[PDB]
C-alpha cells in the first residue's frame, strides 16, 4: 500500500512478490511482470519471492512455463510459506538460485480437485487429475533429483518440510542465512 | 393421508400392495424392505404387487430393494405408473419375469449412474473406479433382466433415454403394457 | 382437518376423492391408492373426483390418468374453483357424460413447462422429451374433447382461460352443474 | 386445540352444522369447507348450515369453490361475520342465503378489487391482465346480484380498500341483519 | 401439555369441561377462532352457568379481539374475566368486556392500555384510507372502553395516547375490572 | 417423553408439577392450569412444585405467583439444579416452611431485564415501568424472605449466585433437603 | 410408515426379533438400537436377533454403544447387510455372531479410517489426535479379531475408502456368507 | 497490480494483449477495443494475444474472433496455463503459423453449455439455437484445424483435455514454444 | 481496463468510436448519449462508429440512445460484434441506412418486449396497456427501418427469433455483412 | 466513465445529465452543478437532460427550487423516460425551453410513501403526504396550465404519456424533432 | 488516510507501522518495506512500531526471518498491544533495541490451529503444529534468555505481561519513558 507502491518500487529492482494464493489473476500479473522484466533486460536475474499456500495448477504452470521460457535466470526465495503449487514454483527457480529463509515452511502434497455428474464424466475428470499429478511428479523429479516413485510416496499426504529439509530433498539449493 | 383405523397405504398393504412413489433413499428402502419381509412372513406363496412411480435415487438403497425382491419366495409384480426413471426403472425390470407391467402412458427412463468426488487425486480415482464398477454391476443385471447385450445397455444409458410403455416392452424392461380393464 | 376419521376419510367412505392441491408424486400416490382401494371395495359403483388444482407434474398426473382409465368403476370429475394445466387434463379424463364443472369454476389449458441445463446434447434430449410429452397430451386431449390435434396445439400455445360454459363448448366437460 | 369419542372443538361444532372459516382462503381451506358442506348436506339436506366468517380473504378461485358449493347444495347456508370479512371473505359473507346473512355489531367488512401479478412477454402480460379483468367483472356481477347495488357502483366502491361497519354493510346489501346481543 | 385421567384430556380440555377458557397467547385469527368456538360450545352445553375466561395476553389483532368481544356480548351466559400476569392492548379490552361485577385481576397482574398500532404503504390515497380506518378503529375502541369503565371518551383518548401501565388496584379504580381477587 | 400418560401427567396424578424450563406465557399457562386442576381435585392436600428454571417473563412468573398465593392448598417448592431470576422468585413463593433446595442446587437473584426503543417519552415510559416492576419484585421478596427492601435492592443489583445453604440463610428457602 | 393389524412396520418386525438399522449412526439411533436389543433379551435371552444393516456409518462412540451391547447380551445377533454397510456400519456388520453375518449378493461393504476434527491450542490438537489414533487402533484391533486378517493388513486396507462386493466381504472375513435367493 | 503505466498497459504499448480470465461481454469489449487500437497505431506489426482462459460466453468469444479475422495485423496466440472451451477456440483463431502453446499448457475442447426454461416451444427454440451455435463452432474449428466436422463433433461430446503437443497434432496450434 | 492518459475507451472515443458492450440500462444510456452529444459538438460532419455487443435491456434507456442517434447531425454507423439481442438489435437497425453492419459470426435476435405487473386489477391493466403500446411503437419503427410489414414484424417477434448476420441483412436489420 | 469524465466535459458546455433515480445524493450533485454554472455565467442557459424513473420528493424539490432560484434559464430535455419526480422536474424548466425527444416517455402519478406505528403517527404521516401531493399538484398546475382537479384525476394512477401528449398536456413545450 | 500517505512519509524516515493482525498481506508489505529500507541504506537503523494481536505463524516468520536477514538493525517499539506473533516480532528486534511504552501490553501463548479429515491427516496436522510450537519456543528462548521448559510453561495459556514485566522476562530491553 505505501507510496509507486512498495511493490512497484521492488519491481524496478527486478523483484516480484508472490504473496497470495495462485489463481488466474495472480498468474496473469506474475507472467506480465516476467515478460516486462525480460523486455527491459534479457540478461539480469529476476528475483521471485514466494509466500503462497498454492492454488490453481494451470495458473501455476502459466508462471512455471514463463519462468522456463524467458532468457533471464529467475531466482526463487521462499519467505514464510511455499505450499503445493507454491513449493512447485519454488523448485522451478534457476538451479543453484533457489532459496528459503531458515524458518520458511515448504509443503508438498498431491493435487486436489472435484468431479460431479455421470460416471463417464467422473472418469474423465479422474483421468485428467491423475495425468496432472503425473506431469507434476515428473517435473518435480527432474528439478529435485528424486525418483518419481519417491515423489509419489512423499506427496501422497500433506508433507511439511523445514527449509533445511527442503534443501535435503532438492526443492531448494541453499538456506539463505542471516 | 386419508383414513380407512388405517391410512390408505397400510390398507393397501393388507392386500399385499406396496406403493413406491418417491425418490429412493435409505429411509424409503427400509420401509419397502420391511414391507416385503412382512408380507413373506404372512404368506410366502401369494404374489406381491409393487407399484412404482419414482424418479430414482440412491443406487445402494435401490439394491436393498432389488436383493430383497430376489431373495423372498413370493413373486413381486412391478407396475409402473407415471414415471420409472434411473434406479426406479431398474426396480421395474426387477419384478418377477412375466409379471412386469407399465400403464400405457407411463414413462420409463434409463441412464448411467450419477455421483461426485472431491479431494486428492487418489480419492477421486477411488470414487471413479467405484462408480464405474457400480455401473458395470447395473448393466450386467439389466442385461440379465432384459435380454439385451451389456454393450447395448452401455450405449443406451450413455445419456438420458426416455421410453414409452410400448418401447419399454420392446426393450425387455417390462413384460406387458396393462391395457384398460 | 375436522374429525367426524377426518373429513376427507369420511367422504372417501362415500367414494368421494378430493383433489385440491398441486399435482406432485405424493398427491398422485394418494389419489391412485384411493382409486385402487375404491375399486377393490366395489368395482361397480361410481367414483367422484373433485378437482381444484393449478396442475403440477405431468408424469404424476398421468399416474392418476392411467389409473382412472384402468379401473372398472366410472370416475366422475367435478371441477370446483380451478382446473388448470394437468388439472384440466384430469378433469377431461372423467367418464364421458360424467365430467362436470360448477358455474364459476375456471378451466385453463396451456402447453407443458419444463427446464434444461448443461450441454447442447442434453438440452436437445430434454427438448425432444418435452415436445414428445406435449404431443402425447394433445393427442389424448383431442380424443376426449373431440377437437382436432392442431386445434388443441393452437389453443394451448399460451395460457387459455375458459369459463365452465366455454369448457363445455370445448369438450373438456359434459355439463355445467346447475344448483 | 381443546378436546371434547374424542373431538376437537371444531368437530364438535361441525356436529351442530356449524363451520368455522377463521383464516385466509387458499386451496387447502376451500377443500376443508367444501368437504364439510358436502358432508352436512349428505347427513341432512334440510337443516340450515351455519358458516362463521373471520377471514382477510385469499384466493379468488378457492373462494369460488366455496361460493359455488354453497349455491349448489340444498341446505341454506347462513353466513355470520365475526371480527373481519375482507376481500374474498366479504364475497362469501354476501353469498349466504338471502335473509340469513349476518354480522356482529363490531365486525368489519372490507371490499376491494382483486389482486394479481404478471411476468414475461407482452402477450403473456396481456393474457394475465385480461384474465384478472374478467375475474373482477365476474365478482362484481355476482356482487351486484347479491347486494342490489349497480355494477357501476360496485366498480367505483371497490376501486380501493373500502372498509364498512356492520351497519354500513347492511345498508350496502352485503348482509341482511346486524345480529344484536 | 399434561394429560388428565377421567377418557383422556389435555389440561386445557379438562378445564373446558368446567367452563374455563384459557387465553394465554397473542390474539390472532386462530386464537380468536378457538375462543369463539369454545364460547359457542359452552353456551350450547348450558346457557345459564357462568363461563370463566382467564386472560394472560399481550394483545394482538384488533379485529380478532372483536370476534371474541362480540361473542362474549352475544351469548346468554355471563363471561367472567380473570387477568393473571398481563392483559395488554386488546387483552385489557377483553378483560373489560367481562360481565359487569365479574371482571377480576389477581393482585400482581398487569394491565396496559394504549392506542392501536398499524401500518400503511403505497399511494397517498391508500395511506389516507388506512389512516382513516385505524382512526375510526380507535374511536370504536375508545367508545366501548368508555361505556365499560365509566370514564369519559376524552379521558380514554388521553390515557391511551401512550403506553399506560396499571396495577390491578389501579385497574379497578379505572373501571377496567370490578375487584382485585385476594388470596382465599 | 416416556409413557407410563406421559411421565409428567403421571406425576401430576400425585399432585407434582415439574417446572424445568424457561418461564414464558405458555409455561405459565400450563402451570396455572395444573394448579387450578389440582385445587379442584382436592383443596386440602399439598401440591409439590419442582423448579429447575433460568427465569423468564416477569408477567408470566407473576401469573404463577398469584395463582400459588390464591389457591387453598399449600404449594411446596423444590429447587433442583438451578432457580435463577423469576425462577428463584417462584422458589421463595412456596408455602412457608415448605420451600426446599437440594444440596447442590443453585439459586440466583438479580434485577429484571428489559428494553426500550423510540421517542424520549416512550423510553421514559418503559423505564418507569421496569422500575415499578423491580420495586414490586423487591417488595414481595422482602415479605417472603424477611430481608429489608434496601438489602434486596443491593443484592439484586448484579447477578447474585447462592448455594442452597446460603439461600436458606438468606430466607429464599426454609430447608436444604438432605438425602433420606 | 405403514401400520399393521394384530404397530408400524418396524414394530411388527421387532416382535419377530428383527431390528432395522437403515440410517446414519448417531446417539439417537444407537440409543434406539441398544434399547431394542435389551428389550429383545428381556423377552428371550436365548433366541437369535436379526439386525439388518443399511448404513453409511456415523458416530464411532454411538456404534460402540451398539457393538458392546451386541457382545454383552446372551442372544446371538445376526447381521444382514442390504444395500450398503460403510464405515461404522461395516464394523457393526462384522460384529454379528460368527457364522451369522450375511450380505445380500449386490450389497456393498466399505471400510476406511475414522474421521474427525480438532480446533484450538497445540495441546488441544495433540489431545484430539492421540484420541482419534487410539480410536482407530481399537477399531482395527477388533476388526482383525473378527475377520482373521492381520492388523497391519487391516491398517493398509482402511487407509483410504475401500469398497468390497458381498463376495469379497466374505473372502475378507467381514461376513460369513453371501445370502443367496433361498 | 504493479506500476511501471500499470503492467498490462505497458505490455499493450508493445502490442501485447492479456486474456487471462473468463470470457464475458466486458472482457470481449476490452479485447476488441485493444485490437482496434493496435491496428489504428500500426496495421502492419503483429499483435500478440496471450490466452489463459477457462472459456466463457460464446457470443463474447465470437466478438473477439471476428475482430481478429477482420483487422489487418496478424494476431499471434500464445496459450499459457489453460485454454479451455471458448478459450481454446480463440487459441486456434490466431494467424496460421503463429499459434503457440507453452510446453505444460493445457488445452480443453468440449461442446457449448447452456440452459432453457419455460414452455415446450421456448425450450425447442433454445435447443435449436444452441445446436446451431455448436454447428457454427465446429465448422470454423474444422477450417482452422483441418479436422473433419464429424471428428470435431465426436471429440467435443465430452470434456477433451489435450497437452500442448497433442494440441499441435490436432491442429489447434502450430508449434509448441520451447524455451529460449 | 488498459491505459493508453486515457483508458482504452476514451482513446477510441477520440477517433469517434463508441463501444456498447453490455446490457442496456439508464447508466449505459447516459454514457452513450453523452458520448453521442459530445462527438456532435466536436464535429457535426464526421461519421460516428457505434459497436454493439448487447443482450438488450431497458426499452426506454434504448430509446434515449435511439432518439439521440436520430437527432444528431453526424451519421452513426452501427457494427454488431458477437450479439445484438432485444433492444440491442433495435439499436443496430437504428444506424444510418447503408452503414449498418454485422461481423460474419455475429448473432442478431429479435423478440417482443418483456415486463411485469403487480397489484390491483386496474394497475395490471395500466401496465399491460403500456407494454402493448411500447411493442407497437417498437414494431412501427422496426418496420420503417427494415422495410418489413408490421404484421410480419409482429409474427417474427412473437418468440425469440435468432438470425445469423447474413439473415439479418436479408431481413433489413443491417445493410452489409462486414467481410475480412 | 470515459476520459475529465464525459459528464464533466459536458458540464463545461453547461450540460447536466440527470439519468438515474432521484435521491439526496443525486439532488445534491445536480444542485451543486446548477449553483456552479450560475457562478461561472449567470446569463447563458443551462441544459438539464432528464432520464429518470423518479425518486425522493424532497430531493426533487431541492433540484426544483434551485432551478427556480438561479438566474440562468434551465432547459429541460427528456430522453427515454421522465417518470414521477422526473416528469415534475421536466415541467420545471424555463417555459418555452422544455423538450422531449419524439419517442421519449413521460409518466405522472401521485406520490408514494409509508407509515408505521400508532394511529396518531399514521395520521400525521397521511396528512403530510396529502399536503405533499397538493403542493405537487398546485405547482404542476402552474407549470402546465391544467386545473388542479385535472391533475388530481390524471395522477390518481400511473399515467403514461407520449412526447406529443406531454406537449399537449403542458409538461413540455416542444417535441424536439431530428434536425 | 491523511496525505504520500502518512505511512509512506514515515517510511521515508525508515519507520514501519505494524498496526493490524498479521496475515500474508501484512507480512508481504512489511517484508517489502524492510528490503526497500535496506536497499536505501544498509546501515541506518529501522524502526518497527508494533500494535498487533498476532495472526499467521508463517506470515510472522516471513517478517521474522527478513528482520534477521537484513543488515540494518531493526528496532521494535510496542504501543498498545503485542500479542501472540506480535509479541514474537517484538522480541525479534535488535538486542538492546526492543522497547515498550509504559502502558503497552504483551501477551504470549501457544499457537492456534485446526485439523479435519482422516486420523492420519489429523496426526500430520498435530505433528506439524507441535513442531511449530517447538520452533517458536526455541527462538523465544534464544531471544529472551529463558529456558525452553520455562517458555513452554509460560505459554501454555494466555499470559499477559505489563511493559515492566516484559523487560523482566527479556522480551524487551527497555520501557521507553516520556521524553
Residue numbers in the entry:
A (entry chain M): 4 to 6, 18 to 192
B (entry chain E): 4 to 7, 17 to 193
C (entry chain D): 4 to 7, 18 to 192
D (entry chain C): 4 to 7, 16 to 192
E (entry chain B): 4 to 9, 16 to 193
F (entry chain A), H (entry chain N): 4 to 7, 18 to 193
G (entry chain F): 4 to 9, 18 to 193
I (entry chain H): 4 to 7, 17 to 192
Excerpt from the publication:
Bacterial caseinolytic protease P subunit (ClpP) is important and vital for cell survival and infectivity. The caseinolytic protease P (ClpP) subunit is a compartmentalized structure with two stacked heptameric rings that form a central chamber containing 14 identical catalytic sites sequestered by two protective axial pores. The protein’s mode of action corresponds to that of a chymotrypsin-like protease, and it is described in two main steps: acylation and deacylation.
However, when the same assays are performed with a SeClpP sample supplemented with 20% w/v glycerol, an increase in peptidolytic activity is not observed. This simple triol is known as chemical chaperone and protein stabilizer, and if used in cell lysis and purification steps, the ClpP sample becomes homogenized with a higher concentration of extended tetradecamers, as noticeable during size-exclusion chromatography, where only one peak is observed. Conversely, glycerol revokes the positive cooperativity, since it stabilizes the tetradecameric SeClpP, also organizing the binding channels.
